[PDB]
C-alpha cells in the first residue's frame, strides 16, 4: 500500500541486487550457443536501473517540487517496460531450453574461445552406445539447472510485477 | 539503527527467501556426492527460521504485553545459533569443493536414481591422453559454477549477519 512506500525501496534495492546476482550467474561461459537472457546482458542493466530508481525513492519519500515525482513517474514507466521485457524474455527462453531452439543468438568472443566445442540445446549422442554416457547425465543435469534458474527468475519477475502493480496507484 | 528499525523486518523476510531460493537451487541432483550445504537440509529450516523471526518483528512495533519481546529474544538467540552453524558449514563446504573431500556425505536415493555415477571432486581420467574430453571441460565448468553460487551465498550470508548484528543491538 502507499502508506508503507518506505519499505518498498529496500525491496526494490534487494531486487536489483538479485538481478545482479542472476546476471553474474549467467555470465559463466558454458558453450557457444549461450542463452538469450545473457548475451543481451539484460539482468545487469535491469538491476542497476532498479537500484537507481529504488535508491532515489529510498531516502527522500517526501513532497518536493518537480524532479522527485517527475523522475518517479518516468522511472516507474521504465520499470514496467523492463518488467514486460523480462516476462517476454523468460517466456521465450523457457521454450528455447525445453523445445528446439530457433534463434541462434550468437555470443561474444572472450567467452566463446573458452568453451566453443559443446552444444547444450540438443546434446543427444548419435551412436546408441552412449545412452548411459557422462555427456547425457551431464546434459540432463544442465537442463535441470537452466530450468531451476529460469523458474526462480520467473517467480521473482512475477513478484516484482505484482508489487509494482500494487504500488503504481 | 533503531531510528528506522521498523523497516528491517522486510530485510529479514527477503533474506530468508534468498536462503530458500539458494537451497532450492542446490536441490538439483548434480553428481553422486551432493555438497554438505544440501545433504544436511540446512537451507530449508534456515529459511523457515528466518521467515518466522521476520514476520514477528514487523507486527506492531510497540511494547506488547509479554509474548513479543520474550520471543524476540529466544527466537533471536536461536537464529544466532543458526547463523554461526551456517558459517561453520560454509567454511567446511568451501574446503570440500576446493580440496579433496575428506568426508563422504552420500546423497539420497530418490534423486541419485537419475545421475548416480559422476563425481564432482576428481574428474581426472587415469590416462592423461584422454584429458581432451568433453566431460572435463564440463566438470571444470560445473566446478566454477558451484564456486560462484557458493561465493554469492557466502557474500549474502555475511551481509545478513552484518545487518543482524547491527540491528539486534
Amino acid at each position, epitope marked *: 500500500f502507499m502508506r508503507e512506500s518506505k519499505t518498498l525501496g529496500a525491496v526494490q534495492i534487494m531486487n536489483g541486487l538479485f538481478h545482479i546476482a542472476l546476471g553474474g550467474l549467467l555470465m559463466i561461459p558454458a558453450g557457444i550457443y549461450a542463452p538469450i537472457c545473457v548475451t543481451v546482458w539484460y539482468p545487469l542493466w535491469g538491476g542497476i536501473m532498479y537500484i537507481i530508481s529504488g535508491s532515489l525513492l529510498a531516502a527522500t519519500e517526501k513532497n518536493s517540487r518537480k524532479c522527485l515525482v517527475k523522475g518517479k513517474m518516468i522511472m516507474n514507466s521504465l520499470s514496467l517496460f523492463a518488467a514486460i521485457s523480462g516476462m517476454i524474455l523468460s517466456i521465450m527462453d523457457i521454450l528455447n531450453i525445453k523445445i528446439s531452439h530457433f534463434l541462434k543468438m550468437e555470443s561474444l568472443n572472450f567467452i566463446r574461445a573458452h568453451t566453443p566445442y559443446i552444444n547444450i540445446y540438443n546434446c543427444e549422442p*548419435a*551412436n*546408441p*552406445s*552412449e*545412452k*548411459n*554416457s*557422462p*555427456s547425457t547425465q551431464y546434459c540432463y543435469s544442465i537442463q535441470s539447472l537452466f530450468l531451476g534458474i529460469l523458474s526462480v527468475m520467473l517467480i521473482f519477475a512475477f513478484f516484482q510485477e505484482l508489487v509494482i502493480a500494487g504500488i503504481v496507484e | 539503527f533503531m531510528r528506522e528499525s521498523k523497516t528491517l523486518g522486510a530485510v529479514q523476510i527477503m533474506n530468508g527467501l534468498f536462503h530458500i531460493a539458494l537451497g532450492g537451487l542446490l536441490m538439483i541432483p548434480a553428481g553422486i556426492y551432493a555438497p554438505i550445504c544440501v545433504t544436511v537440509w540446512y537451507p530449508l529450516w534456515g529459511g523457515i527460521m528466518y521467515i518466522i523471526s521476520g514476520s514477528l518483528l514487523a507486527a506492531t512495533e510497540k511494547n506488547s504485553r509479554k509474548c513479543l519481546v520474550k520471543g524476540k529474544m529466544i527466537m533471536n538467540s536461536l537464529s544466532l545459533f543458526a547463523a554461526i552453524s551456517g558459517m561453520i558449514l560454509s567454511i567446511m563446504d568451501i574446503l570440500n569443493i576446493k580440496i579433496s573431500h575428506f568426508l563422504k556425505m552420500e546423497s539420497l536415493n530418490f534423486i541419485r536414481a537419475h545421475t548416480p*555415477y559422476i563425481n564432482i571432486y576428481n574428474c581426472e581420467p*587415469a590416462n592423461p*591422453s*584422454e584429458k581432451n*574430453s*568433453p*566431460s572435463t571441460q564440463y566438470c571444470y565448468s560445473i566446478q566454477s559454477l558451484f564456486l560462484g553460487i557458493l561465493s554469492v551465498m557466502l557474500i549474502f550470508a555475511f551481509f545478513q549477519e552484518l545487518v543482524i548484528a547491527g540491528i539486534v543491538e
Partner: antibody
Amino acid sequence: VQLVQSGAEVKKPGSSVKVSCKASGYAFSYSWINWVRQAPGQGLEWMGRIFPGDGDTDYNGKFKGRVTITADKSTSTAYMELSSLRSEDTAVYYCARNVFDGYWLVYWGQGTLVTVSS
Amino acid sequence: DIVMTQTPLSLPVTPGEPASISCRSSKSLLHSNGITYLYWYLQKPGQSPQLLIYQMSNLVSGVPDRFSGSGSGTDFTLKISRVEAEDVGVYYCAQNLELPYTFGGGTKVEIKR
C-alpha cells in the same frame, strides 16, 4: 588393463556354455559390456549387448531375443548363455569394454572358440 | 538389416607403391552434425582384432603414422602412405550411426611376390 576370458569348451548341440570375461584395472561398473562372435566364412556379427550398471540392453533384432544376459556385480564378471545351439553358432566369442568419448572398443579379450558338434 | 559390401574381397599388394581399400554404406551415413562416424578394425593372424583408424581421420597412440582415410559420405577410401610387410590381416569397416550396428565382410590383405 587386462581382459582375461574363460577357456575353450567343446559341447554338443542343445547344451549351454558360460564364459567369464573377467577384467581388472578399471571401473567395471562405469563401462558397457558387449559380446561379439566371429563365425568361419562370415565377417563379424553383433549379437547383443548389456549394461552391467542397471541392466540396460540393446538387441540387433535378427536373433529374436533368445539370448539371456546377466551380470554379477560381486565379482565384476559378465556371463553369456547360448541355448538351443545350432551348427551356425560355431564361432569365437569375445567380450569387450566400451570406453566412452570416441574410443569405442580399444581393449578386447582373446576370445573363446566354441565348436558345436554331435 | 543394412548390408555391408566390400570391393575387392582380396587384394595382393606389393611393398611401397599401392594402397587401396574401400567401404560404402547403403544409407549415406550422416547425422547432420558435420562429422561421419566410422571405425576401422584390424585382426592380425592368430590374435584379437585391433583398431587402426578411429573416426576415419585420426590415428591412435603407438600405431605408425603411415595410415590415412578419407571420403565424401557414401564412397570411402583407406590409404596407407607406405605399405609394409607387417600390416597383414582382415580390415573391417563399420557404422555406428544407428542400431543395429553392422560390420563389413572383410578384406584379406596379403603380400605380392
